[PDB]
Every structure is written in C-alpha cells, then in structure tokens.
Amino acid sequence: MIVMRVKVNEKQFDMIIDKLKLMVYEYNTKIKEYGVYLKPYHIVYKNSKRYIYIGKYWYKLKWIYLGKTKPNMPNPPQIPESTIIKEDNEYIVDEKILYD
Amino acid sequence: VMRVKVNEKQFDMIIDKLKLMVYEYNTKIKEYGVYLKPYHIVYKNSKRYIYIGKYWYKLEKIGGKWIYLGKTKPIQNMPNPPQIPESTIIKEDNEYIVDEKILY
C-alpha cells in the first residue's frame, strides 16, 4: 500500500469530525440503554502538537474513558483508524513589529 | 518586504513583549480605574485578527466588567502611555495532515 497524507484547512477538518459524530449519532442515542458513549475521535497534545486520533473511544459516566473496545452491546458502525496532526499555527505579521 | 509569516512561539513572544511594554504603565495608572491593553482580538470571517494598538478599558461593577473606553487617553492628567505601534497581525487558517482515505 501507498497511503498519502495531505493538508486540509480548519473548515475541511471540521467536516471530517462532523461526519464522524453524524454516523455515530443514531447509534449513540441508541446506547442510552447502557449509559455509555462512543466518541469517534480522541485528541492528544503530545510533542507540542495537537494529535487528533480517529477511532472508537468509549466513555462511561465526568465521562470516564473506559478504553477502546466494547465493555452485549449492539455493535456500532465501523470507524477507521487514522491519525490527524495539527500543523503549528502561523501568523502573518508586518515586519516593523518584529523590528519594533 | 513588510509582511512575513511567524509561528506561535514567535507570535507568543510578540504578544509577551507588548504586555511587558504596558506592565509598568498599568501599575502607575492602576489608581485611575483604567487599564491599557496593547492589542485587540477580533474574529472576522472566522480568522483570529490581532490588532496592535492602544485600547483603553475602565473598571466598573454592574451586578457583578472591563468596559471598553476608546483608543485614546481617557483623562488628560494621567501619565502618558508607552508608544504602542499600530499594526495588524492575521492568524492563518489552521491546517491538518490527514490520512488520504479518511477523505472518504
């Protein structure tokens, strides 16, 4: 396999997050039966970067993170694994401010 | 060659330098009820603008603050501010490396 990695802006990134909430929303209202929640991503601040992990990350009621596998539940829809990296923020400044 | 691109660490330094520029002034004009913030942060078409300049605020309570005043020294017999330059900093859009196939 060749897997490419490509750059998208914040608006595109919210797209990927928003769909992942959308495809688990109908399931997640179903899980009120067992009082657990499937959040389809996990955000990690390591190496002075936002890491934004895509996967099944399970929460139990201050919602505690049980882990990454089903704790007799109904089998959510499939989430890909993948890794999303925030680029460092960058600012357009006029030089004179750097010059002072 | 006026406009260049810097990262958060340098931009944080830029903000930090400005805050030190006004720190001693704000202690001196603490007693007038007045705070001089040397920048103003604006969310316009979903970018974070940071304008550099004199932005004056006053302390008042209503019920239970920091109401904006103006760009200019509110009281003629306060000590003069340090010279903030007027300039515009624009934060670029956040950018993400994504696995290709997650794009459907």
Numbering used by the authors:
A (entry chain B): 1 to 61, 69 to 78, 81 to 109
B (entry chain A): 3 to 66, 69 to 108
Published text:
To gain further insight into the function of the UBP protein, we determined its structure using X-ray crystallography. The overall conformation is saddle-shaped with a basic, concave undersurface and more acidic on the outer, convex surface. Homodimerization is mediated by a reciprocal strand-swap of the C-terminal beta strands of the protomers. This strand interacts with the neighbor, forming a 5-strand beta sheet. Examination of the structure reveals a potential π-stacking interaction between tyrosine 100 at the base of the C-terminal beta-strand of one protomer and phenylalanine 13 of its partner. Our initial determination of the homodimeric structure of UBP in the absence of DNA suggested the establishment of a symmetric structure of UBP at the origin.
We identify a hitherto uncharacterized protein factor that we term UBP (ucm-binding protein) that interacts sequence-specifically with the ucm and determine the structure of the protein both in isolation and when bound to DNA. UBP is a highly abundant protein, and we reveal that it plays a role akin to bacterial nucleoid-associated proteins with over 300 binding sites on the Sulfolobus chromosome. Taken together, our data provide evidence that UBP functions as a general nucleoid-associated protein that plays a key role in facilitating the egress of the MCM replicative helicase from DNA replication origins.
